[PDB]
């Protein structure tokens, strides 16, 4: 059943690169360019959703 | 090549195909096979990785678990790094001079713990022929010690 | 509590642990330090292990 | 490091080239080409299957299974969970038996059953203890939690008051405290009476957060170990914590192997309790509010957790740190503490007061 | 990873990759020279899966194969016990009172080869019992009871026979995967033993022979323990200087039966090791009923007590001679004459059992 096969492959993936995610991003403490650039990308994405 | 023979047997066996060593069949099965056969030899490698006394990859992995990055540990040789982390993974005994004379000698230098000369708890270590930080980290707590070479 | 992976790891280790005792505890038949034992507690414990 | 996908690509492609004299396998959508895409990926999964191999030799960089195991034959043991005990006021109508075994319910369904019978003839309320059956961190309640009963008994109300909370459950710990315990056996080699073993020694009591040891603290024969049990508001010992840290660096069992190990007999330790040593620092911020009070007070208690110990010397640049690293302040001008602060080894330095 | 994939799923992705990347699309029913060569190469990756995962399952020592429990040992310091032999005595006798070589051998029927490795005299002719042990490693070399072996060499005036009425003992192979294992686990995980008045115990009982030991911390002040040691196996129970030298040399360092490493004294503190002075006390106890059995049996309950509740530094009053000798219930009446007071001692000198009059 080829039709009922890719949304089992896709909930997979999205946990793989979810996991994934959370385990490579890294806390930074700093109030700095590093934390305020951050800050920026998380709502731009956040903005394109 | 072993690889490339193995490959060539898994093909079907047929007046067909041609599996002569002078065959496109038997050029292409050593390009085919050159990578699994890389892939083989990292994964049998990693059997060496296992211990820290021989690891190459994974030496700052060992040292960071096992907190080396110390007095002992000389300054670049990999040798002596991995001699460091060796040790110290199984590092553990008690406080006799006997003890302390075979550990001095685990490290590769030769020592011998004499009687005192002065008091009773200070004890004399005679060096013959990182040594001293290492035995003023791992000394007894009560003991002192005294250094002299010859 | 044991699965089917573990059970025959534990029961060897238990068999290897009380198997010392039991040797242990035989290979002192008559000794004049045994003499001094009393008799219905060597049998005792000779059947418990 | 594994090699990449791309790197696997172009290796496989100039191997066919080299065994096949004037052939281009990069072109597009050919035999060849596909031939190369469908090694290299099954190369990739062969390398991925690899790493996975690698990366659990250590129990750092372990997977939860491999780091149960590495625990067990290292040594370090899991603690189990413990159940919830807690005071239970049960009214009674006449004289009366209670036997082992009568089971209390919440009004959840967490069922508490008494071990021993107990007998009563005072015809009122009574106090007994029970403890509960689930043995989790659900156990424990609150602080006047209404049950019933279950079982019926002869001569008691089936409804019944605890006035008490119900406290001691808890739960088994998790694979990283194991990993912790782990790695921190490993990082420090037991001897016998070592300046890091008296450390883990008297570490491994309950309550205490950290403790020092100083090696020929008055003497030739004498080494010192000072703690200090911050979890309670004291932040300090008392004479019975002493004398108890004292009793079992002295002497205690080992779960291991069922001996009695401790410290060395001909010795002395002479457990004592740290002096408190206050500093009062002068700081002025710009803009005044308790959160960013509260704030700066924090990261000074912070790096005073981290960077002070008994007989240490504190600089007055790690306070300007631990100041300026607050986020919402503007201005963090520092007055008082212009010169070097230093203890004797019984005295630990502490923020005290802090004056803005 | 875990679970790598299974063959069928390696054809079916391998086959799939050489088909989207193609212009054409293939019929449903094909022979296409392609399809061999995406079986071969699944073939070849499930190869290679497989040999990573045995890789993999070398790791952790729990799990590893026999030769890499075996690297795993050599890396630890945990040496492997090979197999040992097997002794037991032989009931020979003699013609003419001989002297037996250093190296005399015996065969059995199986054809497996006995030796001594001894000299010994005899005085006059009858049978002698004398420890053999055999020449094969494994536990094929271990008879069983009225075992008859025989003589390769003659010998003069020795009869080529040999009962052996108690059978061999011993002949253990060499050491299995678990055992091993459990070897190098106990290694790893025995806890280090820094001086104790218990450990000093356990040191000086270590040694063959000792079999009481006391230790006194804080003898003479600090800075310095005492030890006492006893042999009572021995017709003399109290030891002589040798041993104390001994087990003086055993204390300051040997080497752990349990783990490779080396174990010993603290540095700092002084032990001193002296033999226990004998403090006889004679009990000079009454019989009514006077025999051999009744002596030897109160004689042996007395030396029972004094071997359970007697100590270097310690009391003894004469109730407790009373209870041992009234014990025995093989009496009519008995009378305790000699020890009327509370009898002590200091550390150096320990209570015993002197010749007891009148049985």
């Given amino acids: ?49 | 090549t072993p690889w490339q023979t193995a490959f060539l047997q898994l093909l079907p066996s047929g007046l067909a195909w041609n599996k002569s060593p002078d065959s496109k069949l038997s050029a292409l099965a050593q390009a085919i096979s050159d990578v699994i056969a890389t892939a083989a030899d990292d994964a049998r490698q990693m059997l060496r990785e296992r211990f820290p006394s021989t690891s190459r990859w994974y030496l700052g992995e060992w040292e960071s678990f096992l907190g080396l990055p110390d007095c002992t540990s000389e300054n670049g040789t990999l040798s002596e790094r991995q001699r460091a982390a060796a040790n110290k993974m199984r590092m553990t005994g008690n406080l006799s001079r006997r003890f302390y004379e075979w550990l001095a000698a685990q490290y590769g230098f030769t020592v011998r713990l004499t009687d005192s000369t002065e008091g009773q708890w200070v004890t004399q270590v005679n060096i013959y022929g990182a040594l001293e930080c290492l035995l003023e980290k791992y000394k007894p707590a009560h003991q002192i010690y005294k250094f002299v070479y010859h | ?49 | ?356």
């Fill in chain 4, 1 to 356: 490091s594994p090699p990449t996908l791309s790197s696997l690509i172009a290796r496989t492609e100039q191997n066919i080239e080299q065994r096949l004299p004037g052939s281009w396998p990069q072109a597009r959508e050919k035999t060849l080409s596909a031939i190369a895409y469908a090694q290299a990926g099954l190369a990739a999964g062969c390398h991925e299957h690899i790493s996975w191999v690698g990366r659990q030799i250590i129990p750092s960089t372990a997977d939860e299974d491999e780091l149960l195991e590495h625990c067990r034959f290292w040594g370090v043991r899991r603690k189990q969970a413990t159940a919830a005990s807690g005071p239970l006021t049960v009214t009674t109508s006449a004289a009366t038996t209670i036997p082992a075994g009568t089971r209390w319910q919440r009004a959840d369904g967490v069922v508490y059953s008494l071990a021993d019978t107990i007998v009563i003839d005072r015809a009122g309320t009574t106090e007994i203890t029970v403890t509960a059956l689930a043995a989790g961190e659900a156990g424990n309640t609150g602080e006047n939690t209404l049950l019933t009963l279950i079982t019926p008994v002869a001569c008691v109300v089936s409804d019944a008051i605890t006035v008490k909370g119900f406290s001691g459950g808890a739960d088994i710990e998790s694979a990283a405290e194991l990993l912790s315990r782990l790695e921190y056996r490993v990082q420090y080699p037991p001897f016998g009476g070592n300046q890091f073993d008296y450390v883990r020694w008297a570490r491994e009591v309950s309550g205490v957060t950290r403790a020092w040891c100083f090696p020929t603290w008055k003497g030739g024969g004498t080494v010192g170990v000072t703690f200090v049990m911050d979890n309670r508001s004291n932040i300090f010992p008392q004479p019975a914590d002493v004398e108890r840290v004292a009793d079992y660096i002295a002497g205690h069992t080992d779960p291991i192997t069922g001996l009695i190990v401790g410290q060395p007999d001909g010795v002395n330790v002479t457990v004592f309790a740290p002096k408190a040593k206050p500093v009062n620092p002068r700081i002025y911020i710009s803009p005044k509010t308790a959160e960013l009070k509260q704030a700066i007070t924090n990261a000074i208690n912070t790096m005073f957790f981290n960077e002070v110990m008994p007989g240490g010397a504190l600089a007055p640049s790690r306070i300007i740190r631990a100041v300026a690293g607050v986020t919402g302040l503007d201005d963090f001008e520092v007055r008082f503490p212009t010169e070097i602060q230093r203890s004797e080894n019984t005295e630990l330095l502490t923020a005290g007061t802090i004056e803005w």
């Fill in chain 1, 1 to 49: 059943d080829t039709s009922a096969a890719v949304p089992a492959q896709a909930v997979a993936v999205t946990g793989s690169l979810g996991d994934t995610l959370s385990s490579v991003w890294q806390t930074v403490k700093d109030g700095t360019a590093a934390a305020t650039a951050v800050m920026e990308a998380v709502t731009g994405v956040i903005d394109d959703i």
């Fill in chain 3, 1 to 49: 509590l044991c699965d089917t992976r573990t059970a025959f790891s534990t029961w060897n280790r238990l068999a290897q642990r009380f198997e010392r005792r039991h040797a242990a505890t035989a290979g002192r038949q008559g000794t004049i330090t045994t003499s001094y034992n009393s008799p219905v507690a060597e049998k005792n414990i000779a059947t418990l292990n």
